[PDB]
Structures are given as structure tokens and as C-alpha cells.
Amino acid sequence: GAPCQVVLQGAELNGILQAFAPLRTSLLDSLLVMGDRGILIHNTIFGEQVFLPLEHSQFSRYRWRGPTAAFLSLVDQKRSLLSVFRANQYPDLRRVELAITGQAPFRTLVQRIWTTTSDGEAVELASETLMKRELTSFVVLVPQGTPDVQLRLTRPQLTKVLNATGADSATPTTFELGVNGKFSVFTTSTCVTFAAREENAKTVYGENTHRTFSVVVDDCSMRAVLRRLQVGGGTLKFFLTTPVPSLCVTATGPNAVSAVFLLKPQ
Amino acid sequence: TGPTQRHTYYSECDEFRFIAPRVLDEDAPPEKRAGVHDGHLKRAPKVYCGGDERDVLRVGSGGFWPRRSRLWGGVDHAPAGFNPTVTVFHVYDILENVEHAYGMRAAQFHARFMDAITPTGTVITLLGLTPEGHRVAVHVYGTRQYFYMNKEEVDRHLQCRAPRDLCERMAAALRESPGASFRGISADHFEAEVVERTDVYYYETRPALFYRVYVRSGRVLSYLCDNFCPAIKKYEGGVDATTRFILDNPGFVTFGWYRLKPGRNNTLAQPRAPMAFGTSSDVEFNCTADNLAIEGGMSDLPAYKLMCFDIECKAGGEDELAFPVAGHPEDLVIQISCLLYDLSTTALEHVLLFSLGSCDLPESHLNELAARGLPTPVVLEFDSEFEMLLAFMTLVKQYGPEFVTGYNIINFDWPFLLAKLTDIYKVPLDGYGRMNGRGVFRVWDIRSKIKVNGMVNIDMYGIITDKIKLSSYKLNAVAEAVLKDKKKDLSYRDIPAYYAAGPAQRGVIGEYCIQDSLLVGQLFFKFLPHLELSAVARLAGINITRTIYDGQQIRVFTCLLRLADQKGFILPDTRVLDPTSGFHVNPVVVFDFASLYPSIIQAHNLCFSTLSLRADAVAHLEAGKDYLEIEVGGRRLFFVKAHVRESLLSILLRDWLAMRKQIRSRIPQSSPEEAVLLDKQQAAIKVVCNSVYGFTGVQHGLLPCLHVAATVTTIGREMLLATREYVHARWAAFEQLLADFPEAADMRAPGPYSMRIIYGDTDSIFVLCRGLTAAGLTAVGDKMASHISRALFLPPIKLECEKTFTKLLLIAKKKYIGVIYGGKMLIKGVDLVRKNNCAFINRTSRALVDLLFYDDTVSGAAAALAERPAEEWLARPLPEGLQAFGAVLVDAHRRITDPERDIQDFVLTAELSRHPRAYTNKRLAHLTVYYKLMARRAQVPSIKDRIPYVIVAQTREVEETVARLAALRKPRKLLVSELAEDPAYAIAHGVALNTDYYFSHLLGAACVTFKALFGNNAKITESLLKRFIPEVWHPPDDVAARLRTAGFGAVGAGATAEETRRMLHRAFDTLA
DNA sequence: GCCTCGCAGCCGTCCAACCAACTCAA
DNA sequence: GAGTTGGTTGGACGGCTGCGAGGC
Ligand SMILES: [Ca+2]
Ligand SMILES: [Ca+2]
């Protein structure tokens, strides 16, 4: 068979379907980046950076050889490679393969699809097959390192923070962590406060509560982005030891999607 | 006394409307040099030439132009005792006029002619030339038109019992006519006799008695044929007196050599006295048809004269860049070039330039003509448009050129001149042809037609659009294509500037006008259009003027009329063949029926007179043996076979084809001059034979028979299917082919054998010969075609092997591209070069086609595409070999993005039709460039001419300069009309060309051809062609900078493989 | 009280139908 | 004066955001 092969069926396929179910149409136009670690999916929503890592551990079979590969999700500017994972696209779906063949930088990905039929038997849904050659060259910029602070918020709490965020550049939003774990988010009007502690509606759990900080965002798309992505509770991850500080919000529901927002001024 | 009939052309004039440009008043102040003078001047029309001056209408010794006229205004200018003896003369045209014995009573005509026109009668005038170059008119008396009516129907309707009754009934219908336009008609204006004839329609039709009625005038006949007994069918009422003269005298022709001879009672032709001349001839005769014979042997054309002319016009209104309209007094004719040739020697004899205002031809031009051995131009200068137009018409009357040519002369030059003379100046035109008054001189619109009595008008635009296939038929393009001459040009735009500048600059307009006429003369003597037109005139039995301006029907009608009369007839007055588109690299043999529709008519004996619509008409005959039965348009039709009754159409076609074969047998053993005449003759027979089927199919035409036309197509369709079924059944296996044609053993190629019809259209089929080599297939094809012809079809039906393709692309019905075994590429129904496209796309589109046909790697790979549905190629890698085809598209894409390019390769262009404020839609690309030039560049924008432009990529500077509010006196993503830019600006600032615009146009050009490789699906074709291009992805420059300052690491290019890999390991660890 | 479910409105993308514009003859 | 093409108007399909309010 192919030198590079990825397979989903049964429990692993149900895992990926559950991961895409809340994401709806938000990832259909995107960059797929593939290597020995897994598939990293990249997009920008309202100008903000968005990532979905799929680890090799989440596939029925995952086998890779040779360099990293990158593919744009759109085929012939119409159909998306990621369509198969939308919540109701193929109701009878049973198994999915990616086969990647050839020599860099001219490898081709072929995606194949199987559905359930009489007596539960698999049939290849051959009309739906997609083929895409890798990008001849590409550059993508990715997060790296460990965040200075991490805080976990529920389905409530996170929706309170999003509502407390300023509506526009006319009113910037401050995120702050004060003495004795007093997490707060506020602007010229709205304010919310929580009690952070190390790893009850006011309580928050985090990895590094001692590191006090205060940071601003002043063109804040994040209430648009995180509701577009339907994030049902997540981890706020702060990068503070950096010329442009950043907030990465990672979802903690069925979806492990992350969005990264640049902060100000520090 | 003066002339018997008044001369209506101007021989004297002493007042006229003086119209002239005020700019010719070269001493007037700058305020008063615009527009035209327009008023009435009491002066004789003047002409100036070389410092001398003359009256335009004075005839005498010192004239500025040549003459071939004997009479002028009723004065005889022939030398004393001028009296040529005429034996032989050539006829080029035939007039038809009415003369009255009362009008001609002062002329000293013999009684036998006066009898033929008492009280009125039709005279046939033969126009011609003697071997000594004398202009002749021979007036033939005694020809009468006639028509038929059924005797039983007339006797039962009008209660007639003898022919004299019918004569009085007709006289009554004319006496009682509205307005009494036929006052004084009598039974003596008629003759009627009883004759037996058959209606030409239907086989069952019995002979019957008819009244043959003779008449003295076509005016009377054309009233009787619709105003008198409309319920009673009439026969041959539409036949003109010229046709009766030609058909009723065996051997007579409308173009050719004649001899005068003694008639029945030893009567001779009478020479007219000068004051009885009806025309501008040197000698005229009265005769009857028995005074004439065809002169055998004589065949050389005599010294007829050709005028090649061209007008130049200047608009005089509020915009001199508007196209001139003759009905506007201020839109003048300013110059007329007029070249006079001998039509027999082809020599240029005179070069005349008529000029409104003074005009000094360049010494350069005079030297060029002298070096070429051509006549020195004579420049005729006039103070006003009327004096110039009068002088030109005076030349046309006095020199009397028998043939007239030019480029667009029927559609522009004559209509403009004659509109001026009629509408502005009120001049009567009826005396300016060959007749001295009451002749036809008329233009009318369909584009246009012209009739001028005694003048054969042949416009070279019609000749060349019929003969040569070209992108453009401007005289410039034709001169480059046909003559290979790179001639200069003066746009109407430059004309008004040159005209105002002075006599030297009006001389440059004159040079250009003369050079235009010299090129048209060269076209005329290359194609020799008078020789093909006269060959058709001789064959069809009609005059040369009708050959040019009447349609195809009258040619067949007149030949049928001659034959029908000899036979006793009278004429009454009125999906399996579809192409599976794709590419073949096995050889394809083309079988073609020689003259399919004429040969069906002959083989099946189809005619008006062999047709029956009724079974009882053929009950005495045996089916199949004595007649064809055929279902046509749902009706059952019967056609009796040639031994029962021979078809008139079949006899015409057979006799013409025998004549054509005989002529073409003589061509190889004939002189270089004879071979030209014989070639024109064989070509005339082909055009007439091909028109027979069409003649039967014109509903409401002359003598229609839709049953015959529909039968011809029905038989033709069945013959293709029969040929197909025979080929498929006879040569299904290689052993069967080899048993018929033993050289097939040498032809056998690798792979499976088959023969299948892949395409068929009207008279041709294409047979794919899988598993054979191309080399022998033309020779075996001749034997296949011969075998099929003898197996299936009656002579003269003949299938022929036309050609063998080695490679063929079937695109659609009547659309394909192929390569013939002799290496030549052939294209049908497709244009690979587009007028509106830049050079880059035309050249690259043609390179993709050349590659498909001339790299066997790509040809073989393209042929493999047919093995799978078009949709299936979306989901699997394309064949091995098309990678060389993809490389052309990759190189083309690269060649747009390359910075070192010649921007000229990508230039589009358009002309402003009017001043930019007057446009309805402001987004038209070339308008953007006008405003960008005048505002952003602050340069002078080009005035009402061709703007060149290119399409640029959207950037800053472009987004800013789109705020062109100076146009009065969408911004996120610009439109193509906004992205238009000036090429000089684009070069100077190194501006990037729009990759999406040019490459999407290149794919748009490519897909229209390569659709055939992918089941005609344009979306699949375009999608698969995009996939060859290398896709790349990067974040925007600003975004990349921000993310690097946010500590993001780079994955992909610009780093080693392990750096990219380890960076992804970091990315998955952070995003956990 | 508050999580989540459906309806009603807005937007982008798309195919279709239509229009005004060249090009030409001096 | 008849064929092509870049732009405008229009309705429909599909998917998302915001409001109201049913079930727990
Ligand atoms: Ca002309
Ligand atoms: Ca002209």
C-alpha cells in the first residue's frame, strides 16, 4: 500500500465525528499539516488564528514516512476534504482512509469513504472520493512553548467572560490576575471576578496561580470567534514572557479546538 | 431639329448650387474658414487642370479627360465622312425598351421596323464593340412576350369561342384600368392562337389546349398577369423579352460574338442616322433576329474599358470625426480617384484624380508611378462639389466604361454619389448610362444593389469575401493577404486635418486615394471576375447584370425553360451518425459523396414531371421496376423511372456534367490563355449544377417543388445509413477486409482490428480503422469507396476516399481538428485565434493544440482519457504523458509573473466610439485608462482613437488612484475595468500583471478545444487543467511579522526537515 | 433560575437573464 | 449590422446570529 496511510473506523471514527460535531462549517476552508505526530489543522476566523490538532493516537491506524506535508482543504475550489466529518454529511459513515503517495514536494493525498449497508456490510462510496496534491511550498506560523498561566472555565464562567468582554475597539478589555487568586475580566462598563486556585460557581482551577499579571486586548474579536467555534468551556492560556503577549483559548468539550488572540501592550 | 428622343443628361448648364469648404479661402481671416458656403451661382461649371481652365460640358479638342462619344447634346463630333462597316461585333449587355411608331415617325426607319412598333412594340438592344473598338448598338425588332391560359377554363369563364374574343376581353380589362394608364389599347395590341401543351407538374397530367397570347409590351403583360382573371392560372407570364429573344433563336447568347447577315427575304440591317441614335454609340443598326448569327471561332474579348474608382468624403458638421451622410449638404465628396484600363490587354491607360480645391501630388508619388511605367496622373481641380460631381458623371457618359469596379462601390461609393446628385443637386440620372434618356440608373438597399443600363458594376468586396477566407476584409488586410503589399493608410480621422492644411496636404490625400484604386485594379486582374460572370451568363442564358444581382434561381429557371419548351411543357406562374466527441490516434478514413444532391436527382430520375402524389397515377406500372415509392414528410410519393419518362432536371444535370468533363479533358493540352478560359467555364458549370437542389426547395420561389427537395434529402439520409450498415457488416473482422483487399496484410498494426463509422454529416462519413497503419489506407480507401459505390448505389452516385487522418479530435457536429497523413493540420468549425485576445493567449492556445498533435507521448496519453467517464478523472491521477502538456500551462502561468517580460505581449485595445461623457456604462476598461491618463498621469489622453491597455494586480496605489473623482466635471475587491492600466506606465513603474485575469482567459481559450477529451464537461476540463499549477500558501506580511513577535515558530519552507518536525512537536504540546 | 432548542432575519455565494459596449464603412 | 464579453439585477440555497421561551 501507500508509504503514508491514516485510517478511521468504529470507536476512533466516532471520536473524530464528536470532535467535528460542534465545529460545523468553521474548518472547511483550512490548511492541513501532516507529520509523524498527527494532523494539525489551521485556519483564521475574523482575522484571529485557529488550530485543531488531531494526534496520531486518535486514529485506527497512523503511519508516516518522509517530510511534513501540507494540503489546502478545498479541492477544485468547491468540495472540502473535511466535509466527511460534518455532523450529518454522510449518516451511514463506517470508515475513512487517507492515502498519501509519491515523492516530495509532489505527493498526492487521496481520501476514501465507506458506508454501512445491508447486514452492516461496508461499501466504498466511490463518487465522493477526493484527490489533492501537496503545496509545492508553504509557510505556517504555530504556537510553541509553555504558557505562563493556565485557568480552566466551565460552560458558565466562560460565557460570563465572553459577555463581560468589550464589544469593539472603542472599549478595550482587561484580563487580570491579582493577589490571592483574584481573576477578573473588565472594561469601561462590565466586570466579572473569580477565585482561582491550584489544580462553587465563582471557583476557578489553574496550573500557576501565583503569577500575577494584567493584560489588555483592544480589537477584541474573541466573543465572535469562540461562539462561532461553539466553545463549551475551555482553558485560558496566557503567554506573558514575550514581546507581544498572547491568549490561547483551548476548548475542553468534545472538540479540542484552540484560538489564539494577540494582546497589548507588554 | 436635334435628336428624335431628347437627351436627358446635361450638355449645358449655367446655374447651380455652389457648395464648398470655407477653408479653401486661404486669404480669409481665421474666424471665417469653418463650415461650407452654400448658395446658387450663375456661372458655367468650370474645371482647372495644369494652369488651364475649361467648361465641364464643352466638347472639343483640348479636353482634360478621354472620350469615346460620337454625339454630345445632339451635335455629331465624328470626323467628316465617318462611316465604319460592321460585320462582326461582340455583345456584352442586352437592353429591353418600348418604342412607339408615333414617337419614331421622324426617324427614317424602314417599314418592316415601324410595323413591329405600330402602335407600340418591344425592342431588344444588343450593346457591344467591333474588333476596331467602335461602340455598337444593334436594335432588334419583332420579339414579342407571350403567356398561356387553359382554353377550356378561359372559354368557360369569359364565354370566349374564338381567339379574337379573348383579345377584346383583355383590351376591355385594360381600357377599364384604374387611372386609365392603358388608354387606347385595342384587340390589335394582341394575337392569340390555340396550341397543345402540358403543365410541367405531375406525371398523370394530360396534354390540353391552351391559348398562347402574344403581347407588345411588358407593361401590358404585368397588368394582365395579376389584374385579369385572377382565378385562371397563367403560364410563363414572368418571362422577359430578352429571354424570349435568346430561347426562340437557337444558339443565341447574352455575351459573345455575333455577325450581321441577310435575312429571310434578303433583307439587311439598316444603319440609323445619328439624330435617331438611342445610345452613346459610334454606330447603331435596326435589324430583325434573322439578320443575326453567332460568330463561331471568335472568342477573344475586345477592347472594352474598365473604370476603377474610389471616392473620399469629409464630414462638415459639428464633429468632423462623425461618419459622413450624403443627405447632409455639409458632408462633401472631396476627391474621386478614377483609373481607366483596357480590359483586353489589362493595361492602365489613364489615372484621373478629381479634387475639390487645389491639389499638388507629392513628387515621391509621381516618381513611384513613373518608375512602375504607369500613366502620369491628371489632377482635375474644382471650386465646388457640384462641378466635380458633374465632371465625373460627364466622364462616365463620354468615356462610357463598359465595366466598373472598386472596393465597396455598391455599398458606399455609388449610393453616396447618387444621393448627392439626386437629393442635393436634383440632377436626372436616366441619361447617364448607355441610353441617352429614359434608361435605368438605380441603387437600392437589401448592403445594396445597383443597375446602370449598359454598365457592368463588379465590386471587389463581393468577389473577395466569396473567394478568400480572412479575419478582416479591409482593403489593407486584403492587400497584405492576397497581393503581399504593405501599403500605407489615412484614417478618416486624419483626413479633415490634411484637407485644411493646404494643396500639398490635399496632395497626400490624393496619393492615398490613387494607391487605393491601384490595389483594387491589381485584385481585379488577379481574380478576373468578369470572366467567371460572363461564363455563367453564357451558360444560363441571362444577361451579365442579372447574373451578378439576381439570385441563383433565375439561372436554373432559364435553362429549365429552354428544355421544357422542347419537350412540350409549360411552366405555371407563382442520431446514430452524431459524433461521440473524443481523440483518435488510430487512423480515420474520410469517405465523401461526389456531388451527392445532383447525383441523387439523376440516379432516381426526380422531377416536377416524373412525380405523382397518387397511387392511381401509377396503377398501370410495376412497383420498383417502373417507379420508386418513397415516404417523405409522412406522405407516400411516386417517381417514375427514366424509361417511363426522363426527368428534365436529370437531363439538365447530365448534359452539364458531360460538358464539364469534356472541358476539363482539354485543359492539359491547351495554351496558358486557353487554360484560363476553360477553367472559368468548368467553374461556371459547377456553380449552376450545385444550385439545382436549392432551386426546387425555395418556397414561394420560381417553380418550387418541395416534394423533390424533401425526396433528395430523404434519399441522402438513407444512403449514409446504408453505407454505415454495409461497412459494419462487410468488414467487422480483419480477415473479411483482407479477402476483399489483399494489401491489408501489409497495413496490419499492433492492437485489435475494427472498422467503425465515428461521424457523418450530409455527404461524408468518417471511418475509424483501428489496428491498421495509415500508410496504405488511402489506396485501400479508393478500393473500399469503389466497392461500396458498385454494391449499394446507381450511377452516377459515387463515394470517394477524400483523405486519411493520422490523428483526429472530434469536438462536435461540424467541429473537429485533425492531421492528414501528408503532415498537414486541418481545422473545421473552430477558431484558434481570437481578435480580442492578447498575443500571449492566442500563441499559448495554439501551442497546446500543436503539442496534442505533434508529441506522440501527449497524443497517446490524451487517447487514454476516453477509457473512463469524465467524472472519474477527478478522483485518480491523469495518464502518463500529459505531464508535458501540463508543463506548458505551468510555463504560461510563470510567464505572467516573470518581471523581465515584454508587457506588449499582454496588450488589449479598444477605440472610443464617442467622447467619454456620452457613455451609459462607465466601467469599460479603456475609459479607466482615459481617466488615469488625464488625471493620475496628467498626460494628454488620446482623442477618439485606439487606447492600448493591460490588466494589473490589485495593490496600494491602484486602490488609491481608483478614487478618480476627476471623472465628474467596489473598494474591498476591484473589478477588471478598475484594474485596467496604460502599458507605458506599466513598463515604467514595473507594475505586476493580473495573474487571475490572464490565466483564467488562457484556460477559457483552452477548454473550448479540450472539452472533447473530458466528455464536453467545461467544469471538469477547467478543474483538471488548474491542477497542473503549483499551489503555495503563506500568511500576509503584516500577520507573519506580528506572529513572529508573539513567539510563534515557522513550520514549512525556510527551515530544515528536522526543524519543521521538532516545531510541529512543540505545536502539538502547546495546543494540548 | 438557566441551559438549549426552534424560528425569523441577514449575509455570502451562485446561476441565470439581461444590457451596453466593440467592430466598419470614409 | 450580428457575435462576444464584462457588468448589473434578481431570486434562491445554505449557513450563522439573535430572540424568545420550554423543560428541568
Ligand atoms: Ca471605396
Ligand atoms: Ca474611399
Numbering used by the authors:
A (entry chain B): 28 to 226, 252 to 318
B (entry chain A): 59 to 504, 512 to 639, 700 to 1094, 1133 to 1235
Task: Give sentences copied directly from the paper behind this entry.
The HSV-1 DNA polymerase, encoded by the UL30 gene, forms a 190kDa heterodimeric complex with its processivity factor UL42 protein. The HSV-1 UL30 is a family B DNA polymerase containing a 5′-3′ polymerase activity and a proofreading 3′-5′ exonuclease activity. The UL30 DNA polymerase has the characteristic fold of many polymerases, and although there is little sequence conservation, the UL42 protein is structurally similar to a single PCNA subunit but does not form a ring-like clamp. UL42, which binds directly to DNA, instead interacts as a monomer with the extreme C-terminus of UL30 (26) and promotes processive DNA synthesis.
In this state, we introduced either a 1-bp or 2-bp mismatch accompanied by a phosphorothioate bond and replaced Mg2+ with Ca2+ to halt exonuclease activity. The thumb and exonuclease domains move apart, allowing for the DNA to shift between active sites. The single-stranded template DNA extending in the ssDNA-channel between the NH2-terminal and exonuclease domains visible in the pre-translocation state and halted elongation state structures is not entirely resolved in either of the exonuclease state structures. The β-hairpin loop position is well conserved between the two different exonuclease structures, strengthening our assignment. The 1-bp mismatch active site closely resembles the exonuclease active site with the 2-bp mismatch DNA. It is, however, shifted compared to its canonical position adopted by the 2-bp mismatch structure.
